[PDB]
Design a protein around this ligand. Structure first.
Ligand SMILES: *[C@@H]1O[C@H](CO)[C@@H](O[C@@H]2O[C@H](CO)[C@@H](O)[C@H](O)[C@H]2NC(C)=O)[C@H](O)[C@H]1NC(C)=O
Lengths: 49, 47
């Protein structure tokens, strides 16, 4: 009733990629681009970035 | 830094020496526990 919107509420986020699992009570707010492939991203989002 | 908690133990004592830390024994009681939850891999002093 509070967090949903007819057009879709996207204000809540979740981390989808990370090089390793979190240790207990760890907090990670980084926004570094994750390179899922062999091509360096250089801070540019895209395929495998 | 254990489970995101930063433990800082401290101790002080007067000394009279100018070469290195004097030989002796003392205990460092805990003074601060901080709920940072922050990754740590480096530090640097400031003087
Ligand atoms: C905290 O951050 C450090 C980065 O400084 C992480 O250590 C890195 O882990 C990756 C995993 O593949 C390695 O490739 C790097 O060489 C590591 N760097 C160093 C300096 O160790 C560490 O895993 C992070 N830990 C937490 C709990 O977030």
């Amino acid at each position: 009733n509070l967090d949903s919107k007819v057009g879709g509420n996207y204000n809540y986020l979740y981390r989808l990629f990370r090089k390793s699992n979190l240790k207990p009570f760890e907090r990670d707010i980084s926004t570094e681009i994750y390179q899922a492939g062999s091509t360096p991203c250089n801070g540019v989002e895209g395929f495998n970035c | 830094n254990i489970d995101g908690y930063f433990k800082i133990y401290s101790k002080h004592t007067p000394i009279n020496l100018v070469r290195d830390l004097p030989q002796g024994f003392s205990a460092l009681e805990p003074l601060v526990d901080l709920p940072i939850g922050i990754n740590i891999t480096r530090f640097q002093t400031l003087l």
